């Protein structure tokens, strides 16, 4: 009855990892005006904790520190190479993991200022609606906690205003009451060494290690409060607080400033983004034999018909020195396209995006009566279901083309 048909320009993606480009206006290409393409209906599984972006963040920023060895941290975008995509979850109650609905695609990330800090995140993008809690597992005491703020409070350094501080603490406690069912008190770390107990940052080209013990050892500021700090006859640092790092020990549960290493900082700002592989090759059953990622949530019929012939391979800069990573990405992309084109041409379906072939459709592959194939399933779901038997399908296609 039905026969296998090969589609090329298909919007289906999978999960993968790669390198990126350093959009910034060292790895310093340019950055034109970007654009964001919404998806009509895609339920996407996001996971910031497992994300591979933070590793690249840390490596590249460390290389920048070594190259420099007043920083003026430029908001640096990370641009995906050719053939890949970046997915952003726009939902406003997103715990950093799970399903997202309002999922959009963007070519280059939003600006990130790589300011190093701990126990007090400074110059970070605020929350859209309200303060929230990010954690891999609230019941695992070995994990850390990110508290994301909605109304930033400025700190001059240190000199901190207490009017907003205790209100923010009250809101934080009220929200944590939803997740943890006990009254919550705070207590300074009294940790091992300097970096895990004091507040750390840098301003105007010099480091600051400040005695931030007085901000959590609650038993009434009612005014500006001064904190000791060493390296007031110093240049001032009036950076704004965007969020805090919070940890628990072990019914007055105690929360604990401090937490993990520098990595978590970039987890507090680059959690909305995911890197995704595009795999343009699809197999479908049809009654015949002889832009991209835009409507990737539409029905099989709509996405099939919206497929038209492109005029480009698989773009921001112009006549610019690329660098090692850019050349890596471009060569890998062109090699992937060449391999895929040879694979498609092996069956003789070289020039045409859509190709019907002479292979009977073994009904045991998918069941799924023909009516529900092109009226109810998204392309990504179809690929996910057919992935069990793709290799056998490819081998049978090649064998049948060879037999003639």
């Amino acid at each position, epitope marked *: 009855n039905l026969w296998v048909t090969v589609y090329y320009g298909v919007p289906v993606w999978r999960d993968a990892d790669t390198t990126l480009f350093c959009a910034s206006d060292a790895c310093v290409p340019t950055d034109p005006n970007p654009q964001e393409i919404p998806l*009509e209906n895609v339920t996407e599984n996001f996971n910031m904790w497992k994300n591979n972006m933070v590793e690249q963040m840390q490596e590249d920023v460390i290389s920048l520190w070594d190259q420099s060895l007043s920083f003026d941290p430029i908001p640096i975008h990370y641009c995906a190479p050719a053939g890949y995509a970046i997915l952003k979850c726009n939902d406003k109650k997103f715990n950093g993991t799970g399903p997202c609905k309002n999922v959009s695609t963007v070519q280059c990330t939003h600006g990130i200022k790589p300011v190093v800090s701990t126990q007090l995140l400074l110059n970070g993008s605020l929350a859209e609606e309200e303060i929230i809690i990010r954690s891999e597992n609230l019941t695992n005491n070995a994990k850390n906690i990110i508290v994301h703020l909605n109304k930033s409070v400025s700190i001059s350094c240190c000199e901190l205003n207490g009017t907003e501080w205790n209100e923010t603490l009250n809101k934080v406690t009220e929200k944590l009451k939803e997740h943890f069912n006990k009254t919550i008190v705070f207590q300074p770390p009294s940790g091992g060494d300097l970096e895990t107990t004091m507040h750390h940052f840098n301003c105007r080209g010099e480091f600051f290690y400040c005695n931030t013990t007085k901000l959590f050892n609650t038993k009434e500021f009612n005014g500006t409060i001064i904190l000791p700090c060493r390296i007031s006859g110093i240049i001032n640092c009036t950076s704004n607080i965007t969020g805090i790092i919070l940890t628990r020990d072990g019914t007055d549960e105690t929360f604990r400033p401090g937490g993990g290493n520098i990595k978590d900082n970039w987890r507090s700002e680059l959690y909305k983004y995911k890197v995704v592989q595009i795999e343009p090759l699809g197999i479908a059953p049809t009654r015949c034999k*002889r832009g991209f990622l835009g*409507a990737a949530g539409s029905t099989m019929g709509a996405a*099939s018909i919206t497929l038209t012939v492109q005029a480009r391979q698989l773009w921001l800069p112009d006549m610019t020195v690329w660098g090692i990573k850019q050349l890596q990405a471009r060569v890998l992309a062109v090699e992937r396209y060449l391999k895929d084109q040879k694979f498609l041409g092996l069956w003789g379906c070289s020039g045409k995006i*859509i190709c019907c072939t002479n292979v009977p459709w073994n009904s045991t592959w998918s069941n799924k009566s023909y009516e529900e194939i092109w*009226n109810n399933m998204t392309w990504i779901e179809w690929e996910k279901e057919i992935s069990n038997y793709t290799n056998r399908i490819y081998d049978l296609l090649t064998e049948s083309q060879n037999q003639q």
Partner: antibody
Amino acid sequence: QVQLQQWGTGLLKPSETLSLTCAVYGVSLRGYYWTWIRQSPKKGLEWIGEIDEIGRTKYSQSLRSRATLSIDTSKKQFSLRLTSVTAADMATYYCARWRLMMVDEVTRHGMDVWSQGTMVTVSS
Amino acid sequence: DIVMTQSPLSLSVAPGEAASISCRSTQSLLNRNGDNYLEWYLRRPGRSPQLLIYLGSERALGVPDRFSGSGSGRDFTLKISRVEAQDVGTYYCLQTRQGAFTFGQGTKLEIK
């Protein structure tokens, strides 16, 4: 699930312009056809027009020279404009969403998504 | 340019029984490799129509497996094995091969 809606006139006397607007509240216009069907107490169901999303249009021979079709993208509607409505052309109008399938040809499946329809009368 | 002819216009069948409708064309409704180019639709009295049969063989979502049929050339037919008091109404068959699409003359189904 997807739904359709319509807006139009009430009582219209002959020789004027009839303008009918039809809005879609579901999937975008990218991958379907939108087509108008007419039902009357006489001679049965007929065919009016077909529109893609790019703007490609197709019409019937009966009303080739009197009906035109328009679309937009900002708010996802489509529209009839029929000049010189006569007394014998009174007809309830229906919007519908043709599904399509690409196999070497635009193979046309059924028209599942049908608008609720609106009554149109003639003044005399 | 294309005219259908349905038969019968109206038949009265006892409830729960099987009935057959047949409509004729003026040209062969055969694709080069496909099945056909014909459509089958319901209409309840005073309500919007819905899809029944597309490409002459299959049925759409929510369609009970009581609607079937087939044909070729210049004759096609629809079949009901079991009819309900809910399905009293009208059936139409539609043509798509040439540009001038055209319905039929309506088939009214009424229970004894």
